[PDB]
Amino acid sequence: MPNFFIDRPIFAWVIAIIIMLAGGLAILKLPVAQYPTIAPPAVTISASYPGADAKTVQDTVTQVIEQNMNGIDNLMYMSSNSDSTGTVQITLTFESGTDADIAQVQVQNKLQLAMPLLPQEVQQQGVSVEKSSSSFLMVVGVINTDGTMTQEDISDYVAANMKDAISRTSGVGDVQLFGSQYAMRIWMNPNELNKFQLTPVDVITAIKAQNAQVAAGQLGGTPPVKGQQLNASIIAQTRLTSTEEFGKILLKVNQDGSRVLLRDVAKIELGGENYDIIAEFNGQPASGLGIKLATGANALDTAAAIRAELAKMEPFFPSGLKIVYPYDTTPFVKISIHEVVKTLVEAIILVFLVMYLFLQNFRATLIPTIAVPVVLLGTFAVLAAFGFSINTLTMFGMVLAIGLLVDDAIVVVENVERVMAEEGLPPKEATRKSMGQIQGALVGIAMVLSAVFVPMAFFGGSTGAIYRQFSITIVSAMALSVLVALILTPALCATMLKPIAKGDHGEGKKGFFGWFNRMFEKSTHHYTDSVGGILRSTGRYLVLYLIIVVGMAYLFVRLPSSFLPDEDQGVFMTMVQLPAGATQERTQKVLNEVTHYYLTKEKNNVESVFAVNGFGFAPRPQNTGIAFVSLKDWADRPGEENKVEAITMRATRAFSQIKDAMVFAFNLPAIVELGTATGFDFELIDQAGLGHEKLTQARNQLLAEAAKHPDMLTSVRPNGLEDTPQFKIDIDQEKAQALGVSINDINTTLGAAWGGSYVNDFIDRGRVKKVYVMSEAKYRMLPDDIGDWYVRAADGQMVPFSAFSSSRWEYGSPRLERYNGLPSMEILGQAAPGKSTGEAMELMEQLASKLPTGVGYDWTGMSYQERLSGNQAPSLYAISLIVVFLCLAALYESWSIPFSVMLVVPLGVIGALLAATFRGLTNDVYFQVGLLTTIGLSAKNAILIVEFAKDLMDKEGKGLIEATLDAVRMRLRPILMTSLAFILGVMPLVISTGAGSGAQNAVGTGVMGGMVTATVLAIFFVPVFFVVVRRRFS
Amino acid sequence: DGTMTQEDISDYVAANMKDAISRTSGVGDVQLFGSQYAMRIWMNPNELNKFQLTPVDVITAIKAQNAQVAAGQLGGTPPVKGQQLNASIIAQTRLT
Amino acid sequence: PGADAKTVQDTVTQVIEQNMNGIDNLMYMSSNSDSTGTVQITLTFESGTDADIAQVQVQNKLQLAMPLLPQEVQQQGVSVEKSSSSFLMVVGVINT
Amino acid sequence: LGTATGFDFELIDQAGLGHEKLTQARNQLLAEAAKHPDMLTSVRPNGLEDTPQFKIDIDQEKAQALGVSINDINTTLGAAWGGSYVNDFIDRGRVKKVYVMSEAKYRMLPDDIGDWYVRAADGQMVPFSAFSSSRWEYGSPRLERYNGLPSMEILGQAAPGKSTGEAMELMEQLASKLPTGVGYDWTGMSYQERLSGNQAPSLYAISLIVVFLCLAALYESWSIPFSVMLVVPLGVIGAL
Ligand SMILES: CO[C@H]1/C=C/O[C@@]2(C)Oc3c(C)c(O)c4c(O)c(c(C=O)c(O)c4c3C2=O)NC(=O)/C(C)=C\C=C\[C@H](C)[C@H](O)[C@@H](C)[C@@H](O)[C@@H](C)[C@H](OC(C)=O)[C@@H]1C
Ligand SMILES: CO[C@H]1/C=C/O[C@@]2(C)Oc3c(C)c(O)c4c(O)c(c(C=O)c(O)c4c3C2=O)NC(=O)/C(C)=C\C=C\[C@H](C)[C@H](O)[C@@H](C)[C@@H](O)[C@@H](C)[C@H](OC(C)=O)[C@@H]1C
Ligand SMILES: CCCCCCCCCCCCO[C@@H]1O[C@H](CO)[C@@H](O[C@H]2O[C@H](CO)[C@@H](O)[C@H](O)[C@H]2O)[C@H](O)[C@H]1O
Ligand SMILES: CCCCCCCCCCCCO[C@@H]1O[C@H](CO)[C@@H](O[C@H]2O[C@H](CO)[C@@H](O)[C@H](O)[C@H]2O)[C@H](O)[C@H]1O
Ligand SMILES: CCCCCCCCCCCCO[C@@H]1O[C@H](CO)[C@@H](O[C@H]2O[C@H](CO)[C@@H](O)[C@H](O)[C@H]2O)[C@H](O)[C@H]1O
Ligand SMILES: CCCCCCCCCC[N+](C)(C)[O-]
Ligand SMILES: CCCCCCCCCCCC
Ligand SMILES: CCCCCCCCCCCC
């Protein structure tokens, strides 16, 4: 194949171009992400029971729905929450690989059996089934710069003109309105209602009757009479459109003939469906859309489509209304990937310079510099075929690949330039001879190297999909690299390499190059003279090698391990959690303090703050709040102290002062669904119908016991709310029966007044919206206001609530949790410093075993994936070692000689561990995959040295020591050519600061440190390994 | 130990075992060989006839007196600003 | 039955349209509401979209919008079918 | 497919202006389009015009004063005049619908409205004429919506010797001079022609580049391929 393309350079060029077109066309069409989607699919059922307490919701909705959730494929677990706001949220989590489309269809197929058993009020609020991520992709804030519109006016506009179109955009799994759409608010007055002897029941009946859309048929409608000439639609009652129209709804005509209108017994205004969520952007009033990414959907592509839909709306905004972007997770992905693309382009340039230093011919320098772009672009085409995406790991696979790509090129170019220098053949014949003697080793090496990376594509579950990206990328690159090294690189050598005279090693060149050539030829002569002496010792360096393996073993064992570094993403969140029973006003006091801190203290770092009252992870009215903090560009805030980790740790420390409120600023982890580094997610189960009060006691007992082990467990706390005072009112059925008052009228009057009642729909400026009846605030604030509410008996007399009701204060849950259909209580916590999660969970199980009768436990979220198959690194690298040995045994046709290559592994590991240890890095994904790359090159170096030596001993019949010296003499220039080119190519990564520098620093440090030790040691030790091994086995 | 009848076993299976098994991996349809407990009101027509009542009166009463009412909140949104108390109103719960 | 364009639009078309969220690969959506007492909402999807998945996601979002439609419309039923103007043939049945 | 020159335009109410103001905005666009016969042909709405409809107002006060329930009134009207699907029945083993409606001769003209009586609480039969007033108004017998918002579909095509892309560009220009809140969008063939027309250049290019490169490999020269590639017009001329 080399011989063919040496005679056909234009053919070789055509293949390279087609590969680059395929690669180029792939880059335009390939999806872009931060990581591959490893998170398990989650379908969330959300229903709303207006005016319902936590238990009413649980025992009429949650349980009824949960009991129908059965025969659902690939279901891991099912958590549910039933809170005092009237909300239920059942999350069904599915196995990794589950089709989210089918999971939704199945979950919804079962919910459809439960729907008819649910209350009519819960049905009419719409039960939603959604397949989205639990955290926000972005937040689209909307403000008024002219201050022409209030917080409510903006919220209604966003809901009525923007919300729906965004919800229908592909990849948008869920959209949360930070505010409420307007409804027709009928604020009932009990003084006026009783005065005219009317109830909330009469108001609801009147609205339904007089806010009706009546289908009245047609004049001359079919079937018609003969000779009918007129056909016209009959328009009867239509929906009311204004506060005024609702105002003049006739409730009753008094005996004297005077009219009682709805406005005579109620304040009628346009106002939110609910008054629970109130948002502020940089202190001023705002609304917006919390957009959640659909399961398996592309963040960047979806974010783009969202922005495209917002661009359509902007032209038709009212005066002053303006979109702001106070939280976006996509820009980091778009910018952090561009930073890795930049270090790729920089490495290709930094290669060209080191390539020009040695070849010293602009045309010869391009042969390795052309090969790299062709393979990398080629790899993008292979990714596309295999259905992978342009993510951080694939993009870093390309960066680490560059090392393996130039070596293939350098080996081919260097060996041709040598052949010409030793014999004085023309470029075409020198290439033909050169390709003839290394093409076998190149193809063979790629199979030996593939046995290093292929194994880490066979890791299990979520953590395995991460490694499989690097593996397939690097392996695809090597496959193309060898293919390009047999098609193109030979053809380019034959045409572009300058004819070199016999005995011309430069030296005769004038200037810098002249000095360099003489300095290198004496360095080569010194090196060969130096190695000559090393081999006469042998025993000295075998004792020195055993020291390095012990030093390696020591550093590796003490060096801590992680998964993926926490990156500054130019965004973070602050959670505000007050004790349940705390008011909207008290939460806003804390949110103001949080917003104040970021706008005053962190004005240098923080760009914007989007604070939301009555929202957190989900809507949790009154006692809960969240702040979305977007920072300034990474360039505008240099140093560790101005990065998210420092900012949030200062913020948490500052917010610890705040009273009767838990306030935490936290960075979003590398992957949310893997949780913290050493945290656990524990579930306490009621297995014997003990009840909530007994389960609360069982939890308190466990938490108390967990506190008595600070040595093992750190900050073990519940992920729920505590019981609060609740107003228990008993309706005396006998007294109600005696006075002639129906319980329907009683319950409707209480619920409609204090809870609110969704009557029917109306048309607000051409859009269908809700009509809500409810007590005016001032008549539903005090317990004593209960007696102000009158119900009409059958005999016509108005009866106060005080007449047929008794009340008392009691305690109950504002948020009832269930796990796998049983009453539960989520408990979070991490292992104490030094102790592992496995040791911590073991103690939690032990402590949980001592709990009262009927109390079980379980592990969920991150803890579920931990007790699942893990720690399979010894297994897969035991195989890798065995396969690498066998592959070398086939190459050299020897069971013994492979050891001469396999003993160089530690020479590269020691450098990685030293550099990683000294810079305070950890044994993470980026360190491991960068170490495999270093082991790959140092092994590839060792293969060619032993190959040349063995070839001399077999083909030329030269002696062991003479062959070793002659081998290392020819295999020095190409080794140092690769080391410099790769060490200098990953300099940008090591010094890197800005977006995604955490990964770059981690990749670059482990590689640079390794390559340094892997080069200087190998050139002296590979000879010692070959001579020791060949002597030992004869 | 003969402390549970066919009915008692069937309820425990239906109420504590069936649902968790029906959600286990690879499990399709789950048929209960028995019945879960319901609240059984066994009506006597002679006693109903005596007090001039029907199954209609019994149903109407059970729906009225075995109700789970959504009764709203004290100090709920929108509140009168300065409100300190925010408490759920618990009306009728299900009979147990 | 007996509904004007406005009545259909403001009780059926708008309610259904408002609930057509979280459906994958939707390009655009169009609807008619006329005095023949009929509404027809057409959802056109991206080329290569599984029409079965497209249809099931639409009828599922409709199922949860059904309780918000009038009794008269719920009773009649709301059909969700794959759009097609291409017949193999039209068999005419006549009485001579 | 429709027509290749034909476009499919959607005039959109983006600010809750109403049906009537969207009708006026459409009439304005239809008029301006007619003032460019050189570019646009048969610019016409794919919709129905407003028609006379019989607006009847039930007086709530007279109904409540006469003891006539509004429910019985709106049922009597809807059931008689519009028809009402009551429940099902089995005809020869097939479940079929039961419909109550007025016999044609009692639901033809406005004069028939007063012949329909509703029973009051006191059992007296009150005619519709007693508690109702009627007038003529205009309304839509077919209300269109596009992407959730009120719309009006406009059909048309590029005039003789003009491209479909040119006609669209003018329709967009004329649309940018319509009342505040009146937006527009492309649908059907127009939506697809915009997307499928965007990628046409890239394919034509990729085709020529790969053909060239393939001939270059065959002949081992960058020059000779042109000798082959120059043939393209010799076939196209005769076809045309
Ligand atoms: C480790 O996890 C963290 C971040 C996940 O990242 C997110 C994006 O993913 C989350 C998931 C999957 C949840 O389940 C959450 C949750 O249940 C919360 C809160 C909100 O606090 C949350 O905020 C989340 C939450 C996230 O932000 N609890 C509630 O809403 C309710 C009803 C009550 C609150 C109880 C206390 C106050 C809470 O337990 C507190 C003691 C801490 O333990 C948490 C705030 C944790 O903060 C940290 C840094 O210790 C987060 C769960
Ligand atoms: C190129 O297209 C043609 C035929 C397709 O062949 C068929 C088989 O396929 C059709 C399709 C895909 C439609 O969308 C139709 C349509 O929307 C219609 C009418 C019914 O006319 C139709 O009849 C069709 C129709 C066909 O018969 N409009 C309506 O019903 C409504 C609600 C209002 C009508 C408004 C006017 C009156 C109409 O716009 C008129 C001005 C012309 O524009 C059309 C009649 C076009 O004729 C011509 C001559 O240019 C057809 C769209
Ligand atoms: C020699 C070094 C080789 C290494 C090259 C590495 C480059 C990798 C870049 C990946 C990140 C950017 O990937 C980004 O993807 C989007 C996806 O639509 C592309 O978007 C593209 O959309 C359409 C597709 O027909 C094109 O007409 C348009 O010109 C282009 O913008 C961007 O042009 C590209 O910038
Ligand atoms: C299905 C599982 C299979 C997995 C096995 C694959 C891994 C094996 C890797 C070995 C790589 C091949 O290594 C191969 O070794 C032989 C000597 O033994 C070399 O040399 C031999 O073949 C060349 C081919 O032109 C000839 O000159 C001559 O027959 C001999 O010298 C090859 O040039 C080299 O390419
Ligand atoms: C630097 C950290 C520790 C890691 C060490 C690995 C890197 C090695 C760096 C290069 C060392 C080369 O050092 C080399 O040592 C050998 C002996 O061992 C010397 O050789 C000398 O001793 C030998 C042994 O008796 C004699 O046969 C020889 O005639 C004499 O010159 C070489 O003259 C010297 O060049
Ligand atoms: C890094 C540069 C160190 C000295 C370089 C010497 C350059 C001089 C060129 C050769 N000379 C003029 C001495 O013959
Ligand atoms: C990017 C295209 C590179 C073209 C290089 C051409 C050199 C080979 C031609 C040989 C002429 C005899
Ligand atoms: C060389 C590429 C092989 C592809 C690897 C797929 C294996 C998936 C691992 C799942 C195990 C739980």
Give the tokens for residue A427: 């470029």
Contacting residues for A553 by C-beta, under 8 A, at least 6 apart: none
Decide whether any atom of ligand 4 lies within 6 Å of the A893 Cβ: yes
Would residue A614 be called left, alpha or beta, if left means φ above 0 and alpha means ψ between -120 and 50 degrees? left
Residue type, position A683, single letter: E
Ligand 6 lined by A514 (C-beta under 6 Å) = yes
Continuous H helices in C11-92: 14-18, 51-63, 71-76
Contact C72 D83 (CB under 8 A): no
- Residue D12 bridge partners (DSSP): D151, D183
Are D142 and C34 in contact (CB < 8 Å)? yes
Cis amide prior to A710 (ω within 30 degrees): no
Q: Is D145 on the interface with C (CB under 8 A)?
A: yes
Q: Is A566:A923 a contact under the CB 8 Å cutoff?
A: no
Cβ neighbours around D52 below 10 Å, total: 13
Residue A202 has a CB neighbour count (10 Å cut-off) of 19
User: Rounded to a whole number, what is the distance in Å from the CA of A70 to chain C's nearest CA?
Assistant: 18
Q: Helix, strand, or coil here: B11?
A: helix
Pocket test for ligand 6, best of A360, A507, A513, A515 (most atoms within 8 A of CB): A515
| Cβ within 8 Å of B, A 28-87 | 49-56, 59-60, 66-67, 69-72, 74-75, 78, 84, 86
The two tokens of residue C37 are 């007492």
Q: Is the CB of A366 under 6 A from ligand 7?
A: no
Residue indicated by tokens 């789950």: B30
Do the Cβ atoms of A167 and C4 come within 8 Å?
no
Report CA-CA distances (Å) from B45 to A432, B40, B41, B52, B65: 109, 16, 12, 10, 21
Q: Do D183 and A15 touch (CB under 8 A)?
A: no
Q: In angstroms, how far is CA A874 from the centroid of its own chain?
A: 28
Using the structure block, give the residue that is written with the tokens 């209304």.
Answer: A321
* Alpha carbon distances (Å) from B23 to A41, A74, A663, A864, A866: 16, 9, 37, 17, 22
Q: A133, A138, A66: which is closest to A100 by C-alpha?
A: A133
Q: Are the C-beta atoms of residues A99 and A73 closer than 8 Å to each other?
A: no
Query: What distance in Å separates the CA atoms of residue A96 and residue A468, rounded to the nearest whole number?
Result: 15
R_g (Cα) of chain D, nearest Å: 31
Within a 10 A sphere around the Cβ of B65, how many other Cβ atoms?
Answer: 12
Residue with tokens 């329907």: A744
Mutate which of A573, A617, A626 for ligand 1 pocket (most atoms within 8 A of beta carbon): A617
Report CA torsion sign: D80, D81, D83, D86. Answer: negative
Helices A512-537 and A539-558, axial angle in degrees (round to 10): 100
Which residues in A691-705 are b (16+ Cβ under 10 Å) and which e? ebebbbebbebbbeb
Among A338, A184, A344, smallest CA distance to A266 is for A184
Distance CA A879, CA A952 (A): 32
The identity of residue A501, as a single letter, is: A
Distance separating alpha carbons of residues A432 and A429, to the nearest angstrom: 5
Provide the strand spans (E) within A395-540.
none
Most D CBs within 10 Å, among A164, A219, A259, to test the D interface = A219
d(CA A82, CA A300): 34
Atom 31 (ligand 5) nearest CA:
A533
3-state SS class at D43: strand
Cα(A726)–Cα(B89) distance, integer angstroms = 6
Tokens representing A85 are 């706001």
Encode C68-96: b = buried (16+ Cβ within 10 Å), e = exposed. bbbebbeeeebeeeeeeeeeeeeeeeeee
d(CA A752, CA A747): 8
* CA distance, residue A26 to nearest chain D CA (Å): 13
Q: How was this structure determined?
A: X-ray
Q: Does the CB atom of residue A20 touch ligand 3 within 6 A?
A: no
A829, A715 contact by CB (below 8 A): yes
Burial of B52 (0-12, 13-18, 19+ CB in 10 A): exposed
Shortest-distance ligand to the CA of residue A468: 8
Cα nearest neighbour of C18 on chain A = A164
- d(CA A926, CA A920) in angstroms, rounded, equals 14
- Contact yes or no for C4 and A105 at CB 8 A: no
Given in angstroms, what resolution was this structure solved at?
Answer: 2.8
CA–CA gap between residue A542 and residue A1020 (Å, rounded): 12
Find where tokens 């949030």 sit. Answer: A648
Residue partners of A936: CB distance under 8 A and separation at least 6:
A403, A404, A449, A452, A453
Give the C-alpha separation, A455 to A367, whole Å.
32
Q: Which among D82, D144, D191 has CB closest to C1? A: D82
Distance CA A157, CA A163 (A): 9
A32 lines ligand 8 (CB under 6 A): no
How far, in Å, from the CA of A452 to the mean position of ligand 4?
Answer: 19
Could you give the CA distance from residue A560 to residue A677 in angstroms, rounded to a whole number? 12
Spell out which residues of chain A touch residue C70, defining contact as CB-CB under 8 Å: 213
C76-83 CB contacts, 8 Å cutoff, 24+ apart:
C76/C1, C76/D85, C78/C12, C78/C16, C80/C55, C81/C55, C82/C51, C82/C54, C82/C55, C83/C42, C83/C44
Greatest CA separation for chain C: 52
Other beta carbons less than 10 A from residue A721's beta carbon: 22
**Shortest Cα–Cα distance, C77 to chain D (Å):** 12
Radius of gyration, alpha carbons of chain A? 37
Phi first, then psi: give them for residue A333, nearest 5 degrees: -60, -50
